[PDB]
Amino acid sequence: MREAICIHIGQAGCQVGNACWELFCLEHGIQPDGSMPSDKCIGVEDDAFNTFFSETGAGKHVPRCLFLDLEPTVVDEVRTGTYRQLFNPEQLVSGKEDAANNYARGHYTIGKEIVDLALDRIRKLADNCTGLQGFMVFHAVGGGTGSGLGALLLERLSVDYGKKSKLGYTVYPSPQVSTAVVEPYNCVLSTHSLLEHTDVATMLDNEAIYDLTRRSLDIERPSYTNVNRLIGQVVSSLTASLRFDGALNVDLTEFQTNLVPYPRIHFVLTSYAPVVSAEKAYHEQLSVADITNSVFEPAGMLTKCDPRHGKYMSCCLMYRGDVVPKDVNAAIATIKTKRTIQFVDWCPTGFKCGINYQPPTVVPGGDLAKVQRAVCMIANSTAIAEVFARIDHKFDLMYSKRAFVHWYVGEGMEEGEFSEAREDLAALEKDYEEVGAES
Amino acid sequence: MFHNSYQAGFLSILYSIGSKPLQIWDSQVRNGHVKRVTDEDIQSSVLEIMGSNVSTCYIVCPANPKQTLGIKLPFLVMIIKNMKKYFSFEVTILDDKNMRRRFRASNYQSTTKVKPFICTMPMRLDEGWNQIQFNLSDFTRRAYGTNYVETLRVQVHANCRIRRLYFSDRLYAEEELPPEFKL
Amino acid sequence: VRIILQRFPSWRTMDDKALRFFAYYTEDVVGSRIETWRVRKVKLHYFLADGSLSIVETPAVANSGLQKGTIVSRFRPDGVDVFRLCIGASITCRGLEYNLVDCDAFTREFYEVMGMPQPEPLEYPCDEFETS
Amino acid sequence: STTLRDTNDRTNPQFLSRMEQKQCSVSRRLEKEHYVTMSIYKSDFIDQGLLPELPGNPGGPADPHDTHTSPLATAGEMMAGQLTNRTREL
Amino acid sequence: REIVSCQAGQCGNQIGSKFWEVISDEHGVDPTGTYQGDSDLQLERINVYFDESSGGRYVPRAVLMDLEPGTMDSVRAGPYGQLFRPDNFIFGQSGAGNNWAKGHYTEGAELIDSVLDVCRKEAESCDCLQGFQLSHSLGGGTGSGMGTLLISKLREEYPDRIMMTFSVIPSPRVSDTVVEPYNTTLSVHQLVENSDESMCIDNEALYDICFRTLKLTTPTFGDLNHLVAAVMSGVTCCLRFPGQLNSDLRKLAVNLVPFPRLHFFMMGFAPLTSRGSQQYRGLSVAELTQQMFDAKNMMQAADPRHGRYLTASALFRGRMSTKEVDEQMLNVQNKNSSYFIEWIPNNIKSSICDIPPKGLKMSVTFIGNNTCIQEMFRRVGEQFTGMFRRKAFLHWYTGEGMDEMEFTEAESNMNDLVSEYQQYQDATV
Amino acid sequence: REIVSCQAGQCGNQIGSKFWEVISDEHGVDPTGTYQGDSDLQLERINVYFDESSGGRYVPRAVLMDLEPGTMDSVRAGPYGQLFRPDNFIFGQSGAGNNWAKGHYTEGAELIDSVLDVCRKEAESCDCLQGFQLSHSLGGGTGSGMGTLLISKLREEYPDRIMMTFSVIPSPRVSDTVVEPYNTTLSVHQLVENSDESMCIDNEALYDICFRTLKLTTPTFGDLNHLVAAVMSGVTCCLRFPGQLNSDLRKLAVNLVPFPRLHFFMMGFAPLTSRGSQQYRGLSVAELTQQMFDAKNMMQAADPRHGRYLTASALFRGRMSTKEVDEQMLNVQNKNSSYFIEWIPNNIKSSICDIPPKGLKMSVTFIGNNTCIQEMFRRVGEQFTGMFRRKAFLHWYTGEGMDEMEFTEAESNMNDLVSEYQQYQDATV
Amino acid sequence: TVTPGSALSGTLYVSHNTRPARTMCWMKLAVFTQFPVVPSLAGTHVQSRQDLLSSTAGAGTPEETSLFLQIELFDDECPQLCANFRRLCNGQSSTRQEQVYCYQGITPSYCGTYFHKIIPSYCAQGGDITMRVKPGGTNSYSSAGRIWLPDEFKKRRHNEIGLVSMANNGPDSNGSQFFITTSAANERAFNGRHCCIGHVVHGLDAFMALVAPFGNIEGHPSKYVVIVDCGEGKAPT
Ligand SMILES: Nc1nc2c(ncn2[C@@H]2O[C@H](COP(=O)(O)OP(=O)(O)OP(=O)(O)O)[C@@H](O)[C@H]2O)c(=O)[nH]1
Ligand SMILES: Nc1nc2c(ncn2[C@@H]2O[C@H](COP(=O)(O)OP(=O)(O)O)[C@@H](O)[C@H]2O)c(=O)[nH]1
Ligand SMILES: Nc1nc2c(ncn2[C@@H]2O[C@H](COP(=O)(O)OP(=O)(O)O)[C@@H](O)[C@H]2O)c(=O)[nH]1
Numbered sequence A: 001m002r003e004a005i006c007i008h009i010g011q012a013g014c015q016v017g018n019a020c021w022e023l024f025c026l027e028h029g030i031q032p033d034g035s036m037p038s039d040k041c042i043g044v045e046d047d048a049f050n051t052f053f054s055e056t057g058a059g060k061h062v063p064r065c066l067f068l069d070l071e072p073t074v075v076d077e078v079r080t081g082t083y084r085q086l087f088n089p090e091q092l093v094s095g096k097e098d099a100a101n102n103y104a105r106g107h108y109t110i111g112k113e114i115v116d117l118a119l120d121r122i123r124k125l126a127d128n129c130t131g132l133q134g135f136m137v138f139h140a141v142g143g144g145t146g147s148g149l150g151a152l153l154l155e156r157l158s159v160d161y162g163k164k165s166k167l168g169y170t171v172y173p174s175p176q177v178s179t180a181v182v183e184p185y186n187c188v189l190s191t192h193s194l195l196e197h198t199d200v201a202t203m204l205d206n207e208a209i210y211d212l213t214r215r216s217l218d219i220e221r222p223s224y225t226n227v228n229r230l231i232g233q234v235v236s237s238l239t240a241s242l243r244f245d246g247a248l249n250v251d252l253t254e255f256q257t258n259l260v261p262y263p264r265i266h267f268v269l270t271s272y273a274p275v276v277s278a279e280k281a282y283h284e285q286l287s288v289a290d291i292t293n294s295v296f297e298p299a300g301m302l303t304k305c306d307p308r309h310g311k312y313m314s315c316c317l318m319y320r321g322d323v324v325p326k327d328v329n330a331a332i333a334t335i336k337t338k339r340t341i342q343f344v345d346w347c348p349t350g351f352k353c354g355i356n357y358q359p360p361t362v363v364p365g366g367d368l369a370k371v372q373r374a375v376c377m378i379a380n381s382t383a384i385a386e387v388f389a390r391i392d393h394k395f396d397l398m399y400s401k402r403a404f405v406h407w408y409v410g411e412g413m414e415e416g417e418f419s420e421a422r423e424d425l426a427a428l429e430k431d432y433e434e435v436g437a438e439s
Numbered sequence B: 001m002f003h004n005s006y007q008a009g010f011l012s013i014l015y016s017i018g019s020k021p022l023q024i025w026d027s028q029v030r031n032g033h034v035k036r037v038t039d040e041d042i043q044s045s046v047l048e049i050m051g052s053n054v055s056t057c058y059i060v061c062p063a064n065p066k067q068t069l070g071i072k073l074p075f076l077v078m079i080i081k082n083m084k085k086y087f088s089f090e091v092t093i094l095d096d097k098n099m100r101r102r103f104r105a106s107n108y109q110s111t112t113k114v115k116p117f118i119c120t121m122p123m124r125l126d127e128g129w130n131q132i133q134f135n136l137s138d139f140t141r142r143a144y145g146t147n148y149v150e151t152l153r154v155q156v157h158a159n160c161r162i163r164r165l166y167f168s169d170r171l172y173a174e175e176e177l178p179p180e181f182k183l
Numbered sequence C: 001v002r003i004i005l006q007r008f009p010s011w012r013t014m015d016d017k018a019l020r021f022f023a024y025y026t027e028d029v030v031g032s033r034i035e036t037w038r039v040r041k042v043k044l045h046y047f048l049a050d051g052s053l054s055i056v057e058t059p060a061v062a063n064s065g066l067q068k069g070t071i072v073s074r075f076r077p078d079g080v081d082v083f084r085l086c087i088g089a090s091i092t093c094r095g096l097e098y099n100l101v102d103c104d105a106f107t108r109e110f111y112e113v114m115g116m117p118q119p120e121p122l123e124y125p126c127d128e129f130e131t132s
Numbered sequence D: 001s002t003t004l005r006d007t008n009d010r011t012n013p014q015f016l017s018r019m020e021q022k023q024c025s026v027s028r029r030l031e032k033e034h035y036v037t038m039s040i041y042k043s044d045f046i047d048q049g050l051l052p053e054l055p056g057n058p059g060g061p062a063d064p065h066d067t068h069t070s071p072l073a074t075a076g077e078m079m080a081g082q083l084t085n086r087t088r089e090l
Numbered sequence E, F: 001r002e003i004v005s006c007q008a009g010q011c012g013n014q015i016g017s018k019f020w021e022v023i024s025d026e027h028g029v030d031p032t033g034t035y036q037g038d039s040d041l042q043l044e045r046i047n048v049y050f051d052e053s054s055g056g057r058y059v060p061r062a063v064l065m066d067l068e069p070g071t072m073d074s075v076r077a078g079p080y081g082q083l084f085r086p087d088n089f090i091f092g093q094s095g096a097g098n099n100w101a102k103g104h105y106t107e108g109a110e111l112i113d114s115v116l117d118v119c120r121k122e123a124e125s126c127d128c129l130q131g132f133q134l135s136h137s138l139g140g141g142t143g144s145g146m147g148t149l150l151i152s153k154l155r156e157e158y159p160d161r162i163m164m165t166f167s168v169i170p171s172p173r174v175s176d177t178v179v180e181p182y183n184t185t186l187s188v189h190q191l192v193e194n195s196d197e198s199m200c201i202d203n204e205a206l207y208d209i210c211f212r213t214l215k216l217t218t219p220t221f222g223d224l225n226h227l228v229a230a231v232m233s234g235v236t237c238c239l240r241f242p243g244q245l246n247s248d249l250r251k252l253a254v255n256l257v258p259f260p261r262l263h264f265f266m267m268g269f270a271p272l273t274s275r276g277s278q279q280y281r282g283l284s285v286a287e288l289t290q291q292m293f294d295a296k297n298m299m300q301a302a303d304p305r306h307g308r309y310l311t312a313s314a315l316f317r318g319r320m321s322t323k324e325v326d327e328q329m330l331n332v333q334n335k336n337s338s339y340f341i342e343w344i345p346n347n348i349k350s351s352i353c354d355i356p357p358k359g360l361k362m363s364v365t366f367i368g369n370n371t372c373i374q375e376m377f378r379r380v381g382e383q384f385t386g387m388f389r390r391k392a393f394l395h396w397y398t399g400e401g402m403d404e405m406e407f408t409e410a411e412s413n414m415n416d417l418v419s420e421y422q423q424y425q426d427a428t429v
Numbered sequence G: 001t002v003t004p005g006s007a008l009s010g011t012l013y014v015s016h017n018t019r020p021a022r023t024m025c026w027m028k029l030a031v032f033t034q035f036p037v038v039p040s041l042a043g044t045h046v047q048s049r050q051d052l053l054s055s056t057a058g059a060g061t062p063e064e065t066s067l068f069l070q071i072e073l074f075d076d077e078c079p080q081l082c083a084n085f086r087r088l089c090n091g092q093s094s095t096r097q098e099q100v101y102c103y104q105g106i107t108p109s110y111c112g113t114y115f116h117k118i119i120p121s122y123c124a125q126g127g128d129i130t131m132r133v134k135p136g137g138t139n140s141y142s143s144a145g146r147i148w149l150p151d152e153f154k155k156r157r158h159n160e161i162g163l164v165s166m167a168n169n170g171p172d173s174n175g176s177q178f179f180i181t182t183s184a185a186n187e188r189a190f191n192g193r194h195c196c197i198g199h200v201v202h203g204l205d206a207f208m209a210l211v212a213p214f215g216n217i218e219g220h221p222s223k224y225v226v227i228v229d230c231g232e233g234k235a236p237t
């Protein structure tokens, strides 16, 4: 019933999925052993878990997840971790040899020897599913396997399951920091699959989350744990509408149709608030208007981009907790009267707000504090043009001297595929320019 | 800017006879070069366009991005030499719904893919000098089922030997074709 | 709240800390074929933070013919408190009279800590459909 | 004597100052964890039920104001408006 | 994912001896082969280097190589020398005689077949071979000659496996061999054509580290071997232990080798603190990266100030934050953009392995493809040209059936590599 | 708001050692580098003078400076010898020869590169450096010459940071060196042109305090450095602990420097008393202020009465009422206003710190910019002329690379400072 | 302990859950003004039950031979961890195979362990069944042996003085070393990261007066305080 299948590709995807699944278990009162305690009764909902957890005959809940990673370290540490009983022995695929930070390696040499069994696992999940809403991909385009094998799984899913919803909550190379050097190559190459075979692609680059934790939470040494906790909070905020009963219930298709104006334009902004530490949480008047303003501000967002530099196209707001619709539209009216932001001319409405009743759940040992209300924005806007311009400028700088191209060529991709990638990014950029152009 | 100009028979947008033949062309060149050279095959000066990256090096008409061309002639004809390099061209046109659309053709393309705003298609050019027709109305109706109005922009990327770019309203045999147009 | 937190040192907030009770409501069935007086089984969630009661229908046999799920949303029933919640008691909400007769381990531990000894579960009345 | 041919306790807990204890709840957690000697997944992704319910370290005895008593946030309470009950009463 | 090691020559044999010593110490393995580690994670990926026996003894996947049996006995009976399998000790009767030609064409050729058999036996005994790591010195005869022969045969047999090599480049400052330029020139082209990634080691640079960074009164070749082993283990720490941002040999080669011939890397490590200042210095990641990028802690005798970084790799180990493993590299890039190539944005690759080296809260290993590495090749080429102009010491090589034109070919290949580094040092956008 | 200290010469090294003893006693720090104080206020701002290491040891932000290595073992033989970092101990093979010329131009210059490296590292180790501090004696070569060279370089590098300095002025009647006038003349103008604020110490003005106020039987250099450390800690008591009326080195400089060239101050500490008088003496704010403004409680030779106070500053420590910190200086302002010039009224900065030194419930330090500071300058100038007019001992300085025109310019600036401090005394409003 | 609820109720639940009764452990403490020449050898001898004066060479005359500490264990929340504590008090191994450390077999017991990190006004930690033969010392060993037992119920707050908790190397890593909190103000540091095994009910004043105050900030112990004899049940005398 309104279930979705989560698929985590790459190390970043696997860690993001770990955070998302611990958050989901906390939300549904599911112990790490995989079953709700008989002594305790959380009472969140009779069948809230049904979207993300499949029920067995022994009273045990198993996540509808697929941890697909081409190297054994992350999968084996997940196996040896606390959630060993929660996660299935299958659905937790490990590859023998890493993709070695190469889109060609993960898409043409190591990708095919594992995509068959990955699709088999996906089918063993889908046939169990009865009202499957869609697939939620979690990966990073900058990484080798997360780009290549992610792309392979995406177009195989598109050709197999038809027109099911595909939401890739994907981490992009950051504007200034970046782990790798072939990372621009991987991102630009994976943009193909994230364009044609992804219904919604969600920007989760690094420095935005990094600085958000830096000042909003005031943590001197936050890391991937905190970043993944924030990402999982965003994921839960988006999926709560289909999980629990809400004032304005919006399913994956329900909001992706309002978020995607044109087939190529699905890369979207991300912003969640209130994010606050325990010390500062119990001192502010956390109002719906205040949290909406904080979300709308260029500072407090999960993806490093400036909405002021671009043109807003369509924002989907996900309110959760004791939020009131009058507070929601009062905040909407105030932010529309505010001239700092601006919407594109051909989209006057530009707003899709949905309210759910269950507030964000506490993650003990984390950094979020207990909040009675929260809101997450998924905004399609022309601001992605500048970040994509930076990405393919780095791509052009690397490709002018044909550096690092031998690694990709030797792994089975033609030299012209890089030209394909550069052409596709240029076409997407001028598509954003066209949709932002005034009539 | 050709809205208030006669458009029948022929309308040349680029030819190497001129002293400064890039009057209405802007050369956005990065890691490349656009210059007038002499060809060994035809023993006449043509326009050499190269770049390590095909996307970064190109010539765009009109030079002003805000300005747009106004050619109604549905036939785009090019005289371009294939150097076995990565080459592409792009034609931005207007439809009957008054929203500009794009047709790009590249020699590194695999299959013809239609998009809401751009149709990407491949080319397989013969050895040596090539003379290429493009039926803008035919491609528009075949890809989009949409009526052709006029051409806003013509763009040619790196790795090309430009000799003549001209619009014509109909097929012109080599017999009818004016001597200044033939090779 | 002060005394409820004082008596439970390990507790910090009452959120998601409902009391799980087990009850049943009985209705006369006149146009049936096998039963004449049907017993429907419910699970009670009494969230203490909000003072809120929720009823969820739970059948017993696989071929019950009833619909499993929540029949009563979470809200505050009129005149229902922890003292009123007791085994062998009556809970009148939404026009339905539930015979509260069974509890859970956490709820019983809560009641003994408070000081009122919650009784033992008594029985579930045997309707004609169960013996079939 | 010569030819060419760490006595310390590496286990937690170690002394945390007055300011360090209030800081280490969320901020500077990596700095203030003296000897964890384990990976990140095993350090962070643990049994959440066993840890204290509220984020970080609570200041002292549980604050009653932490719990929410207002019924308005309830799902059924927002299903059924207040003036419907007012109509009942009138 | 398991890597198999080879040691060639006396220098390579002691390098491998100390490498295996530190590996066994970090994995909690006594010289008897038993396991006494302080963590469960030690046995998680011990199969990368150690193969279990019927009795539970751990045997290193090491193949040992030299014509002289003296250093073979030394490595066999060293403090940790009882770990190695006896049948991996392939030695000849007559030594290489400090001759590249003897080690590569006449005496090493008749012995290379057995070593190929041994490394095969060690290779298909592995579940999924990542590749080979060989350790040698280009100055010596058998370390350079038959080591290059073996890496060539390994490229022929296993093309896609990572062929890591640790070549100790001889220097005039610490020269103790008159045919070091000859052997080095004859070996660099083989290294270029037969190695996925090469790591150059300079005895003089290790010596400078020992005097100044470590303040050791009497440094020893054992101390040099320990310093080299500290990064030999740190390059595969990510392969052996979990971390926030893990990597492997190809995972870093793809980020450090923009072009096929640019696989020569300069070696750095951190932290390195003297005995008296160990308790005073505050081990913080900012200090780690500052000392890492510092030229004095660089155990490559190629000054980074005279070149431009093609690429860099920082394998950090310990409990640290992504804040300071990414922003520190970005800060270094920003304030040293003159030393970093423009057309390669963010020249630095970062990897995180959570398990730190024993006795250190955190550490980091540096792998740099900086263009300054060509100056040691320049000086060895100048020495080779000076010696080869008057054809000195040529008869020893030519009496082994090795042609005269091969020396000129080696000169040409080394000069091509040097100019290849130059062109990307001064290459602009 | 951090202060990084540097002690140069034998006098400077011993004074800094005793200063670190006093500061560690105030902050509850053992010689091994551990905190064991009974109050949290010590740890609140213990970072002003100390930096915590990985193991929790508090290393002083101190630099050790001398050309003669015979004192760098004495300083580590001091009670807090191992407290300092070992790398900050930077010395030379040969001493300064008691020569400003070779302490400033030949031997100090070749050694100052590592000095600047250490100072830069320690300064950037601080979050926000309030400034540098130096301790030295102008009568010698190492403290005067190379100390002033460090002062010049640190003004080159960090102009905005406050540069605190404690220079020991030699006196003829306590003299033990014949080139004291030369070194003092060559260093005083360096201090004038490079020191933010330069209060002076006279060994005579320490000895008379010991013999008359403290009634000590055998005063020693240890007692002298203890008296110096008194004010060295009192000047930053307000930085290190909270108070009812805060101040810092920059606030003191702003209040006590009316003109840029007038930054030579005069000091005193209260309470100070002997054994017998201590039981008879009644501690009070009035007693503290009367003692600090008394002439015999001063650590500069010249009498306050002869000159006139351009500005004064009283930093009190302990729990006291602001009534008697305002009214007592009101008294001393009115009762002998001849100390205080007229065009600047309300001449006395006041500051209160709530935390008195351990063992004392009430104390105060005094910093004064009187016009009597030029009296010992006149004395050392006369002694300089008596030797310079006959080119006495001038071959020593001229053979080290410097020339006579530096001596002439030092004399010129010396007399300029003397005239500035002289005629503002009798300037008419 | 647990009674399943009515199966025909339609859901699986626990009707009755009875917490286990709180159990009892006792230890005997010997304090020495000086340390023995070989603390590990002294600990092994005391574990082997030889005479205390002969076993502790160089420790001198014990200031107090008998200091009895009584610990009540919170077994309602710590089944496995307090079972480990009881087994270590009784010197009973939970595994059949014998643990060997540094080429010598070791028995799991506190009978030779000594308090090695006593931080005044913070806590006193000791109980390394290794006897700290190696310089650093290890927390890995427990009753089961080469096993880190998972943490359980970190909810107990550390207000009261005398709380005994397994001093961990991190989450889900509990061995043999236990620390007794020695002040009421360290709830901030001790909460959420250590499991409250039990609390001392007898000997609080003696532990506060003779063992706790000595030490330093790093935890170096000034007084050699050793568990000479430990067990379950009420303390003798
Ligand atoms: N948000 C977030 N991003 C991460 C996390 N871990 C890694 N990343 C980023 O995701 C990118 C891709 O991951 P990779 O390091 O390439 O790992 P991979 O995807 O398995 O690819 P390989 O390295 O070839 O194995 C990295 O460059 C990181 O910057 C994480 O935990 N959270
Ligand atoms: N770092 C290091 N260098 C060594 C060691 N042993 C020898 N060398 C260097 O290797 C060079 C001689 O190599 P050699 O032993 O003759 O190599 P072989 O002839 O191939 O066995 C000398 O210049 C030494 O500097 C060692 O243990 N460590
Ligand atoms: N107050 C004090 N004065 C000192 C000390 N050591 C030396 N002096 C004075 O400094 C003068 C000699 O300076 P010197 O130490 O040689 O300077 P240096 O050459 O820079 O080390 C003598 O006249 C002493 O009176 C000391 O520890 N305390």
Ligand SMILES: [Mg+2]
Binding pocket: A010, A011, A071, A098, E246
């Ligand atoms: Mg990976």
